[PDB]
Design an enzyme around this catalytic site. Sequence first.
Site, mmCIF file in Angstrom:
data_model
loop_
_atom_site.group_PDB
_atom_site.id
_atom_site.type_symbol
_atom_site.label_atom_id
_atom_site.label_comp_id
_atom_site.label_asym_id
_atom_site.label_seq_id
_atom_site.Cartn_x
_atom_site.Cartn_y
_atom_site.Cartn_z
ATOM 1 N N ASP B 198 20.223 -27.924 49.169
ATOM 2 C CA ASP B 198 19.619 -28.163 47.860
ATOM 3 C C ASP B 198 20.427 -27.511 46.747
ATOM 4 O O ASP B 198 20.223 -26.334 46.433
ATOM 5 C CB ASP B 198 18.181 -27.643 47.818
ATOM 6 C CG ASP B 198 17.253 -28.407 48.749
ATOM 7 O OD1 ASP B 198 17.546 -29.585 49.049
ATOM 8 O OD2 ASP B 198 16.228 -27.825 49.172
ATOM 9 N N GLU B 201 17.715 -27.934 41.890
ATOM 10 C CA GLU B 201 16.314 -28.177 42.134
ATOM 11 C C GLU B 201 15.626 -27.366 41.057
ATOM 12 O O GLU B 201 15.456 -26.159 41.202
ATOM 13 C CB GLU B 201 15.948 -27.673 43.534
ATOM 14 C CG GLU B 201 14.581 -28.081 44.043
ATOM 15 C CD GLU B 201 14.396 -27.788 45.527
ATOM 16 O OE1 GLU B 201 15.144 -26.956 46.095
ATOM 17 O OE2 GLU B 201 13.495 -28.407 46.126
ATOM 18 N N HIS B 212 19.331 -24.948 53.650
ATOM 19 C CA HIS B 212 18.438 -25.057 54.804
ATOM 20 C C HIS B 212 19.210 -25.434 56.062
ATOM 21 O O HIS B 212 19.678 -26.574 56.192
ATOM 22 C CB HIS B 212 17.363 -26.114 54.560
ATOM 23 C CG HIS B 212 16.452 -25.803 53.423
ATOM 24 N ND1 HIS B 212 15.085 -25.674 53.572
ATOM 25 C CD2 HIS B 212 16.700 -25.606 52.103
ATOM 26 C CE1 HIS B 212 14.538 -25.415 52.401
ATOM 27 N NE2 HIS B 212 15.494 -25.367 51.494
#
Lengths: 371, 371, 371, 371
Positions: B198, B201, B212
């Site tokens: 990500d 965001e 992640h």
Amino acid sequence: QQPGTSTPEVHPKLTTYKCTKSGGCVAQDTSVVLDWNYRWMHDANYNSCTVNGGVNTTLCPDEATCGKNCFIEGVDYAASGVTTSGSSLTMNQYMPSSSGGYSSVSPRLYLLDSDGEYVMLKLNGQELSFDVDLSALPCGENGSLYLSQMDENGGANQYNTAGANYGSGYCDAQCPVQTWRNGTLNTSHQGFCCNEMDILEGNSRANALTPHSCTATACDSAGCGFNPYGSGYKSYYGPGDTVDTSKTFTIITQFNTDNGSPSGNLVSITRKYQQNGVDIPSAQPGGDTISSCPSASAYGGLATMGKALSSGMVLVFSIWNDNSQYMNWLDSGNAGPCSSTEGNPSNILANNPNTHVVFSNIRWGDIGSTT
Amino acid sequence: QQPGTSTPEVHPKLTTYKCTKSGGCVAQDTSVVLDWNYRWMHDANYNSCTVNGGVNTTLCPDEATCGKNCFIEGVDYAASGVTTSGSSLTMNQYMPSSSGGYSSVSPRLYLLDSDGEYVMLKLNGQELSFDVDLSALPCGENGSLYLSQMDENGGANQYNTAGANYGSGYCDAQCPVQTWRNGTLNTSHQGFCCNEMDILEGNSRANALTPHSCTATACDSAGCGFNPYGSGYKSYYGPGDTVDTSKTFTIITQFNTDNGSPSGNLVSITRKYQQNGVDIPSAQPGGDTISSCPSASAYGGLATMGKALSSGMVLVFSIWNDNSQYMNWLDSGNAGPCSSTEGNPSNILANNPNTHVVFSNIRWGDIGSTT
Amino acid sequence: QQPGTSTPEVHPKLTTYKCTKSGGCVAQDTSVVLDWNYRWMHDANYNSCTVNGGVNTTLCPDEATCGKNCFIEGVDYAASGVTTSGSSLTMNQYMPSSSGGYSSVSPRLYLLDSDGEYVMLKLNGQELSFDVDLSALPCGENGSLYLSQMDENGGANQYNTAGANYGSGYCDAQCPVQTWRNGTLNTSHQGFCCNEMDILEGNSRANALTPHSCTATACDSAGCGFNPYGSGYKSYYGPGDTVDTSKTFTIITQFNTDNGSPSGNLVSITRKYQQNGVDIPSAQPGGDTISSCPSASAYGGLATMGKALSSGMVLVFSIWNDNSQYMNWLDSGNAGPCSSTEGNPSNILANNPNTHVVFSNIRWGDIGSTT
Amino acid sequence: QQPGTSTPEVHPKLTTYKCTKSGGCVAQDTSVVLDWNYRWMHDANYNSCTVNGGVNTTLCPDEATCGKNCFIEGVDYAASGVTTSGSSLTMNQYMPSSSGGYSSVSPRLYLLDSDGEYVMLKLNGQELSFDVDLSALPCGENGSLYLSQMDENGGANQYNTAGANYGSGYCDAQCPVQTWRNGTLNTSHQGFCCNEMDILEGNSRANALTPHSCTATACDSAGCGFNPYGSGYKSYYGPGDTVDTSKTFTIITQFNTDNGSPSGNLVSITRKYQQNGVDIPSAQPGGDTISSCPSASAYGGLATMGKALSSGMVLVFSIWNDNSQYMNWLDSGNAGPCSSTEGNPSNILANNPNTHVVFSNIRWGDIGSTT
Ligand SMILES: *[C@@H]1O[C@H](CO)[C@@H](O)[C@H](O)[C@H]1NC(C)=O
Ligand SMILES: *[C@@H]1O[C@H](CO)[C@@H](O)[C@H](O)[C@H]1NC(C)=O
Ligand SMILES: *[C@@H]1O[C@H](CO)[C@@H](O)[C@H](O)[C@H]1NC(C)=O
Ligand SMILES: *[C@@H]1O[C@H](CO)[C@@H](O)[C@H](O)[C@H]1NC(C)=O
Ligand SMILES: *[C@@H]1O[C@H](CO)[C@@H](O)[C@H](O)[C@H]1NC(C)=O
Ligand SMILES: *[C@@H]1O[C@H](CO)[C@@H](O)[C@H](O)[C@H]1NC(C)=O
Ligand SMILES: *[C@@H]1O[C@H](CO)[C@@H](O)[C@H](O)[C@H]1NC(C)=O
Ligand SMILES: *[C@@H]1O[C@H](CO)[C@@H](O)[C@H](O)[C@H]1NC(C)=O
């Protein structure tokens, strides 16, 4: 899926009550059930019908098939961190293991009635009262006592003979898509929305009363909840504070109607705590109550909730930790003393694997009668 | 499901680039695709194959059947709040409606390549750079630019001929259980875990870089992310602050390896902003980088992410609001100036239905070459 | 006049490209500049150096004086209806005002290069290609993309240090007498003739390709232009027609030489449109090209134009309305569906003050390479 | 600039009249002058003070200097295609040359009065009448008879002793920036706006009555003109039509006030033609008049024009061709039978170099008195 034979389902007995303003409180022959998902399920030859929470396509292609193929077995409640002593329930977040150290057992119980169907609490214009010992639950843990509008017999049909005896048919405001939607193998991949009244939802650091109204299609995910800390009462509910979580206290929730009777129309949800016999004063003047429920407007704010509480709702016991947001929404930031990191389950397991909630003396009935 | 005929799928062209330290930046004939779920799908007679996001059991009982039965049609990107102008993408959170006022269109795009398959970004030991205009996105909105380890051809098989041309096969660290898991009607009801990087965001009030890592079975849900505000830099990223969201700025993310080359081993994820030509200084001394990733340990911390970035990942454009927690985890409490309530989508729709993200000049390549 | 200090000149970045038949297209670090005349200019004490477009005689008597006296400040491009997003330029004809409603801002931009000097397009024996969105421009508006043979550094001398950074030294086939002729205060009151290639010049109702050849002394005012409508193709270029202005289309102009290479001799100017990926067919059989240029004879027809395109030319973005003849020469009468009155600017302001042109993806290079 | 000596200025005599309803028409000792720009100008040593229409910086740096330096000489009207015979003016568009064939002489005359100052026509609430022979003027030519609000003595000052005797100080609604603005070397580079009443403006194919109102700062460029052809009367004014341009006709323009007298307030501009003694009927029923003047609103529509006609205006004779738009705005497209190309001056020179306008019997006065 139908009842298995390898492990019989013996429900842990839990004594509840129904109080009337005149005739006191009556003992109920209730018990607790473990949610359908925590069970073992297999075909006659013992191949599992489940695959990582999903189903075995070959054994479970449609509904008529698993119905005739799979059997969901009972569980060892003790091993599942679930134990009862008269009118007392104790739920553990973890359990020691043969293999490693502790495995995270996270029970989700339902109050089952003597006839083999969920106790249908009708709390409209009434009150549910209980005793809690959140002392164990630290930052990040979520002790939980909420009502969900589930089917009294767990949606048991021709293919599901297990039903409520095996915790079939769960649902909540979150509208979860499940492998088994209302007792049937969800072959249409649809969510399951149903009203959800969240009475207690918290740990020893903070808590939250949150009502979720619903349409047939959706629900009020973000509830119009109440959290003393969030509402600017940082020193009311906590260890050594007004309510004092370090010891046992009582949670009394009254659902007030306009006609003042179960006959109809929810208007407010009154919360009142009391510890050591003496009644604890409100956090906010006039009474800790949920009058206006802004969020719920789009779903028949309050109106629907009350109609739901009238139709009858199932009671749900639960304790769990958030691996994603560490339950920060409940006890961190502006709604709790806990730090962003402090709620990490790994950190919970490390510093307090013995966390457990102990719900005791659950009794619902006329206002004031349960005491 | 196979390609429909009622509405042809014409991908909105978006120009991206691949920069090399020596040969500058080359224009790419890329485009954007709308996620499979936002499309219309039906049988030859026009009965829908979907039912509230789920499937029509009769038309969609197994996989071989929908494969031969259903057709997923293309969409009107404009009507979906998706528009492109050369090397510029503009995504709206809402769109006016024939019926009421505004309906919440929430695009999820994928960078498609000329051959009809997702652009396989290989960012290991390299850098992806872009320009953003978060000025519109207020409290609660979530502008998003992240890489997901999806199948280049959206898992297209014998029963799914649509594939990446119709945004098939999404996945992320959240391990979502989907109606269509990797191009096939998820008949086993299993989640879909895949690595998820990500990059951006956030909104005009705060943001977050979050990696992640993943196993075949699970992922690091709570990422080891970085948020200047959360890390105690409450006056760095915001309206009129060091980075200044009110105007357009550049986001430069470099994935540093130990051998300093794409050849191998991720070690750190360096973030560096620059606005008005001049390079903006780091929030924390030494550089805004993600060195140690504690959470990811249980999934091959960093190691796995880099291997994933090497194998190649799909780019995902997205903007959405949280009806449940109002995106508080991103911009409220201890991680943002926003108030608990301020992020409510209804309140967003009320005070700023015109919110939109404008991603521009997307170029990835050798470090420093994209500028 | 020299660079001011009250308002710094920050050029809006616009990404262009240079394509080669073999090495694809390369991103250029270009930008846009507002024409010298739209700027604010004053002496050290802040008295204006301009008087209704003219000069302040006392501050601006000769050249050496303004040189040492006046400073031309930068502008607020946004406020000037000029905005860029990666490889996309958007120009507005009007802007809302503090005072009244809308004021007619009419930008005239120049493609500036990284070194602070106009990009010297050498289009001889090559092709310039771009995307346009004339949808906004209605009857009377004039979207414009043309090359002018201006001095790369806006004729900047000892008295003009601003130069191209401030859009100094404009000129066109019309041979305009200007207050500042080629960077110097025109103290001789002479016009300024220079070659002018008018690639795009039109609105959503019609358009026109027009080449203007020049002598040192004069130019071919009335160009030997091409207008499908004028040439009897009333249903080719328009809203919902073959080219379809209602949507974005591509304009491809190729300058063909006799030796087929940039080495020399212009012979024809080939126009070819393409929308939705597919190439649009010619209006007139054989190809929409400008072979013979009758008018230009007296100025070295074609020959001179090509030599000019070889020497290098500046790119000019512009959008404007005609208060005198309502641009009828472009879109009314025998050259457009528009009525004599329909083009009145007051009427434009009334019925569509939001008109704007959006030029996107500008790339020039070898034939076929820009695509 | 002051009067020269090499060529004396001898004004071509032209007899005009002033008619009163009672005392008939009186002969005026008027004459015509060639516009300042067509003249030769030099210093005592004979170096020219002009450079391609501009000025010689060395001889013409400011105003006080040319004033004392340059002398503008008179002209050979005959050689300038200007001749008079009693009450008759004949203007040629071209003249044969010593060098090549024909050179385009394009006279611009002003009605000069006996005292050496422009005749100040006060047409408010009155009428100007004349005879024209447009037979020669073909497509593209522009015969012209209009009033401009110029300074009676051509703005002659201490530095300009030439004045009206040499056609100094021109101006019109177009607000032209000139080398000599109102008798002074325009050292401020400003335009020159002044009211302009365009009575006759056309050729043998079509014509146009057009009023231009003005502010001190600007004017109504696009006038609220009248053109029978444009107004849908394609067979009224032309060769062999109702008015019949092939022969001489009379143009009668009456400026009607509200009080019906010169005392005040312009309300309408009535046009009435008459050929062969008999009065020609109107094109549009009720009378060919200019009542509402929409365009002029922003400049004091009509009101200002009348006030201008009261203050007094200079008469301007002129014939010219458009090298840029071939005068299409006047006689092509929807406002004339002429084709887009047909008006090209080169083509005029080729097929009719003998074009000339012949204005005769100019008389202004009370309505009906001039006849
Ligand atoms: C699924 O069922 C098939 C047939 O009963 C069996 O072979 C297979 O092992 C099962 N899968 C699991 C994970 O038990
Ligand atoms: C769940 O299934 C039972 C089966 O009869 C049904 O009565 C009940 O209404 C179902 N609930 C929903 C929400 O469909
Ligand atoms: C599901 O499919 C059946 C048969 O094609 C059809 O009758 C029914 O209407 C469909 N349901 C929906 C919601 O379209
Ligand atoms: C998705 O499906 C395609 C079909 O061949 C396969 O190659 C890919 O590995 C699948 N992904 C996963 C995670 O199963
Ligand atoms: C022109 O300059 C003089 C002296 O600097 C100043 O007094 C005057 O106001 C200026 N005129 C304008 C219009 O600024
Ligand atoms: C404009 O001025 C510059 C100054 O050196 C000069 O190089 C250039 O040739 C000039 N252009 C013209 C047309 O005079
Ligand atoms: C301008 O004036 C100077 C000095 O009088 C002279 O040398 C020059 O030739 C003049 N230029 C023209 C074009 O006459
Ligand atoms: C032109 O100059 C003369 C000189 O006195 C003056 O009277 C007249 O008003 C000037 N006109 C304008 C428009 O300045």
